[PDB]
Design a protein around this ligand. Structure first.
Ligand SMILES: [Cl-]
Ligand code: NA
Ligand code: NA
Ligand code: NA
Ligand code: NA
Length: 292
């Protein structure tokens, strides 16, 4: 269960190498990770979709085996910069117009935004522990609120760049099981060096739309949230118990979305590490249904 899935391919986008999985034939099934993960997140999910489509899992810029930006610093790895690289990669990959999106965390902001911009090219959306509408601090799990407000303060650089707290604390804190040393090492790999190599993992929490900031991301999220609440695009909502960011009022909101089926699995935030086989089977049933 610790082994990566497949063998990564590489494409140069805007002078940087992006790494991604691309296996199989047919209409794509696109799996997008978030913070502080990579395509690896999906390694026990993707085998359940074998033979049902072209399976794609991209590593965001500066993450996984994609190259780092230079010079890195606080103005880099914003949502929009990530979107520039990922959307370019998706274009380069010639996805066509029957794309299924499988999305999590910042992967869900990116994927929901993509779908909102390309409504005619998305066959269906499976999402989990996603950014579904703009947040307030009350929506955030109490037990990590102090850490997240830390990230979103000048203390963030020390917390992440020097102390790697997102990788070392937040990630295993939001997985119910204990990862193996080997799993751990894979997740740490892109961020082993203190300093700017760890930047994406600090830029990301600074982009979360909370209390109206950052405004640009709030607007992007509001836009797709309003669209999804009325859209007839097929959806699969994978709810988690106890879950983390899709709880309370946020969970009520996404449950109101049209043309959607839902499952519940055990998990906190990184639920792929806790309930892969249920997740995989639900996505396989959804894709089979859409593609019959
Ligand atoms: Cl984050
Ligand atoms: Na991915
Ligand atoms: Na992807
Ligand atoms: Na990216
Ligand atoms: Na980032």
């Amino acid at each position: 269960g610790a082994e990566p899935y497949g063998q990564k391919k590489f494409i140069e986008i805007a002078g940087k190498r992006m790494a991604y999985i691309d296996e199989g034939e047919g209409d794509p099934i696109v799996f997008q990770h978030g913070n502080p993960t990579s395509s690896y997140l999906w390694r026990n999910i993707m085998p359940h979709l074998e033979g049902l489509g072209r399976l794609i899992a991209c590593d965001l810029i500066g993450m996984g085996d994609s190259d780092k930006l230079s010079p890195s610093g606080p103005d880099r790895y914003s949502y929009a910069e990530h979107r520039d690289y990922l959307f370019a990669l998706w274009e380069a990959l010639d996805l066509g117009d029957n794309v299924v999106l499988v999305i999590h965390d910042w992967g869900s902001a990116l994927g929901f935004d993509w779908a909102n911009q390309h409504r005619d090219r998305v066959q269906g959306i499976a999402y989990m522990e996603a950014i579904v509408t703009p947040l307030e601090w009350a929506d955030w799990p109490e037990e990590v609120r102090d850490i997240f407000q830390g990230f979103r303060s000048p203390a963030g650089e020390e917390m992440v760049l020097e102390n790697n707290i997102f990788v070392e604390r937040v990630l295993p804190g939001a997985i119910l099981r204990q990862l193996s040393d080997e799993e751990m090492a894979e997740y740490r790999r892109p961020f082993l060096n203190a300093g700017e190599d760890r930047r994406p993992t600090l830029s990301w929490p600074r982009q979360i739309p909370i209390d109206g900031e950052p405004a640009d991301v709030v607007a992007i999220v509001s836009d797709y949230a309003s669209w999804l609440a009325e859209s007839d695009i097929p959806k699969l909502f994978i709810n988690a118990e106890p879950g983390a960011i899709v709880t309370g009022r946020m969970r009520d909101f996404c449950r109101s979305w049209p043309n959607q089926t839902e499952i519940t699995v055990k998990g906190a935030h990184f639920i792929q590490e806790d309930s892969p086989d249920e997740i995989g089977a639900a996505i396989a049933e959804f894709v089979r249904r859409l593609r019959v």
